[PDB]
Amino acid sequence: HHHHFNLPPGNYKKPKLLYCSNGGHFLRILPDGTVDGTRDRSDQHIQLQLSAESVGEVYIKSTETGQYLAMDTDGLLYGSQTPNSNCLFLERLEENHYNTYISKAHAEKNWFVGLKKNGSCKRGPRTHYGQKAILFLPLPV
Secondary structure, three states: OOOOOOOOOOOOOOOEEEEEOOOOEEEEEOOOOOEEEEOOOOOOOOOEEEEEOOOOEEEEEEOOOOOEEEEOOOOOEEEEOOOOHHHOEEEEEEOOOEEEEEEHHHHHHOOEOOEOOOOEEOOHHHOOOOOHHHOEEEEEO
C-alpha cells in the first residue's frame, strides 16, 4: 500500500483489551454505538475481538454487543452493527512497541483510532503520528 508494513506480534485467537497510553483508558464500544475510553477494567464493553481480513487489516468487534468499530466520513468513531469497509483498520506497530490503527477507508489522510487524556475519542483529522493518543497496548482478557 502507501504505508509501512511493520506488524505487531501476537495473534487474534483470544479477545483483547486495547489500553491507550495517553490517559490509560481501555477502548470501549458502548451499546448505543458511542465509542470512548474507560479506566474501569471490569467494564463489559471493552472486551474486543480482533480478526483479520487481509494481513495487516483487522476488524475490531465488541464481544459483548457484536458491534464493529468503525470511523465515519468525518473521522468520528462509532459502533457499526455490520462489518463494512469502514470497519477495516490497518493494524501496525509504532515505535517498535505500540499498536496503532489507521482507518483503511481514510488511510491516505492518516486518520487514526485515538483517545484523549480525558477518555473521549479523538476525531480522525485531529490524530497524527507522534501523539500518545494513537498508541495502544493490547492485553489478553
